């Protein structure tokens, strides 16, 4: 009576489910890409020269006075 | 009027490295802040609630609140907190079903008996009394859906028409 | 149709400003140091001193949006390393029809001027409209960044601002592949050539690409070039994007000369080798051919012989408007499948196959190749497809000192016994014992890795990853499959399994159980339901939830409360429990890592498994709001998500009893249906 009903709801959910070492040992190599414009000397000289010439909670709590 | 420059330095300290307040951080900010205010009774902001707040403010789809998003949310909370205190006329720290209409009205949500009753059913568990966190949560949502309507009613007819995609995209936030 | 970035509507914001007699001030990308940068152009960089944001109307009295057309000479680099973007813009100007989609050509400083402009960018499978106010950074009265060779022209300046806006700031536009700009201006498909290993007939390929409206760029590898000299003795710039703007064959003193036209987005500093603007060998060409091809002009644009091009440049980047390779002599039919995903530390961020302990945690994607789609180009028989894995919003991470991840993907055959059965996840031991049938040509820190493949008909699993594990990022995948003669999916569907809840279906056993759970009033309330769910979940380790919220239970009640009782009677609780049984069956089956929770990938699978055919934008919306900051959804939120979605679909069909695309609502019932749900 009630504890039984809950056990029964639970049982109705069912039962779940159901080691190896790396056999193929597949390996991947990484490349780095070229980033165009990343170097400062790829910017026009003219525009290079142009460019180169209470703790917080208390403060907020205070907004709510 | 540079409450603005002071609030910018304020946001930078709580936002941390990414310069954005996440749901987790916002949960921490809000819980710590309402700890100070015993008349703003609440069982806490959960991550569930805070994530919902971030979702609906998340204009740029970063998953966190940037300055402008936090500022808007905060200013709403600042306004709504005062509404809350004003219309807690029995000073119980919560908003009852009799206190609710006058408080949603003052926030700019002028509903009817039926709507208020459905709000009280959906957002009040405490015998028709609404916590500070449920209250903020509900108004954030109302505000979001209000903005959504205004934006979709561009001709200003008082009528929107949505397909299934925009319908689910707007309503699944709330 | 096109996503409105930040929910800003151009015509709405322009019209309000015009009616207000105001000029637009964008609150989302304000005229402040934060919009410039974060390090080299941040608030604390001395390079930012004296910078003032000026509207074009503040720096001249008669600004033009476009004058003399929108042409490549309108794109001159300023004080930012965004050559990749600018070469993209320059190339785009050569295809007027596609240029007109990125740049609404009708904008003006003279009519309906309100200091607001708009642009359109392709962003990871979607077109996106971006509005900007016209305040542009200046120093010493001059535009600091991109500017037109025509001083009073502002379209390109405004385009670069709009593109800076979506990336957070201008400094974030520094460094990249020209393909990124090409793509964001076309949604096209990349084809890349290494010039040290070029295909034969590459000059014909280049000519064909240009004829066809493809966008072309080239560049010189700088790492493996004069350490600290980017500018070579022949005035070429290394590590810098150029546009390829033309290709002609000319007869020169009796000899055939293949010539390529190249543009430096500086709009200045040109090749000084053979065929430069001042080369005496132009006298050697027919006068009218000379007059049509060449001008003595410092504009960044020059000719060189194809031989010199091959000896000097490293790479040709090409963005075609179809998935068809340029080396093919016919057009094919194509199907795009767009998928999206997320790698998140703690769950889906598995890294590549070098990391077999976590590799199996990556999201997996089905690629089905059809017998009917078979072709035999190159004389190989199989199904042609392209996979392009693109990592998203990576420039916004620059502030964090984060850049592009090293990305790639592998393709695996699914075992015969597993065939025609979606929801499958290939295990760790599967990867430990079986090699990829195909992989990406490399793993590399490019925004996109795009490869062309041919495999036999069947079902394959694509595993996209970063190289190292525990890297956070969003991605999307484009799969282009070659097709025979079709004209699979484009619609939004809820094909959910409906339930038997007639009195005949419900037996004594369940009736006894219900009566025992309902108590004194013969009905189950939300409070009772929460207690029930708290209690049954307490018995099960395999179903994680942070308790079960009363607000979730209230929604479950309302979903099924067909009489108006406000509580659950026999048949209503039967439907509910049957739904709960299905929800947790799905949840546990799809629970690959047996975490007791759904990561973002598992949730996608569960939504499909529950019968929802949803676009990616919906899926992302679901993980936001229903997931935590680790992008994990527990059982409480899982049920809330699926319950709400079923509610929303059904509210939509109803209000639309005759299947038209749309629904009509006023503010009162909009706020009512979106906030309070089940009402009708
Ligand atoms: Ca943060
Ligand atoms: Ca945000
Ligand atoms: Ca009260
Ligand atoms: Ca509460
Ligand atoms: Ca022009
Ligand atoms: Ca020239
Ligand atoms: Ca009862
Ligand atoms: Ca009922
Ligand atoms: Ca899991
Ligand atoms: Ca939860």
Curated annotation (Swiss-Prot), chain A:
The modification Phosphoserine is found at residues 10, 12. This is Calpastatin. Transmembrane segments: none annotated. Inhibitory domain repeats lie at residues 18-53. Specific inhibition of calpain (calcium-dependent cysteine protease). Plays a key role in postmortem tenderization of meat and have been proposed to be involved in muscle protein degradation in living tissue. It comes from Rattus norvegicus (Rat). Each of the four flexible inhibitory domains can inhibit one calcium-bound calpain molecule by occupying both sides of the active site. Disulfide bonds: none annotated. Belongs to the protease inhibitor I27 (calpastatin) family.
Swiss-Prot record, chain B:
Residues 2-36, 45-78, 75-110, 111-139, 140-174 form the EF-hand domain. GO terms for biological process: protein catabolic process; proteolysis. Ca(2+) 2 binds at residues 58, 60, 62, 64, 69. It is found in: Cytoplasm; Cell membrane. The keyword Nucleotidyltransferase does not apply. Ca(2+) 1 binds at residues 15, 18, 20, 25. One of its GO terms (cellular component) is cytosol. Keywords: Acetylation, Calcium, Cell membrane, Cytoplasm, Membrane, Metal-binding, Phosphoprotein, Repeat. GO terms for molecular function: calcium ion binding; calcium-dependent cysteine-type endopeptidase activity; protein-containing complex binding. It comes from the Eukaryota. Ca(2+) 3 binds at residues 88, 90, 92, 94, 99. Ca(2+) 4 binds at residues 43, 131. The modification N6-acetyllysine is found at residue 85. Homodimer or heterodimer of a large (catalytic) and a small (regulatory) subunit. In presence of calcium, the heterodimer dissociates. The contact of the 5th EF-hand domain from each monomer allows the formation of the homodimer and also appears to mediate the contact between the large catalytic subunit and small regulatory subunit for the formation of the heterodimer. This is Calpain small subunit 1. It comes from Rattus norvegicus (Rat). The gene is Capns1. The chain holds residues 97 to 270 of 270 of the full protein.
Curated annotation (Swiss-Prot), chain C:
Changing residue 264 to A: Loss of activity. It is found in: Cytoplasm; Cell membrane. GO terms for biological process: behavioral response to pain; blastocyst development; cellular response to amino acid stimulus; cellular response to interferon-beta; cellular response to lipopolysaccharide; female pregnancy; myoblast fusion; positive regulation of cardiac muscle cell apoptotic process. Residues 491-505 are annotated as: Linker. Belongs to the peptidase C2 family. Calcium-regulated non-lysosomal thiol-protease which catalyze limited proteolysis of substrates involved in cytoskeletal remodeling and signal transduction. Proteolytically cleaves MYOC at 'Arg-226'. Proteolytically cleaves CPEB3 following neuronal stimulation which abolishes CPEB3 translational repressor activity, leading to translation of CPEB3 target mRNAs. Its EC number is 3.4.22.53. This is Calpain-2 catalytic subunit. Binds 7 Ca(2+) ions. Ca(2+) 5 binds at residues 518, 521, 523, 528. Changing residue 208 to E: 84% decrease in activity. Changing residue 204 to S: 12% decrease in activity. Forms a heterodimer with a small (regulatory) subunit (CAPNS1). Interacts with CPEB3; this leads to cleavage of CPEB3.
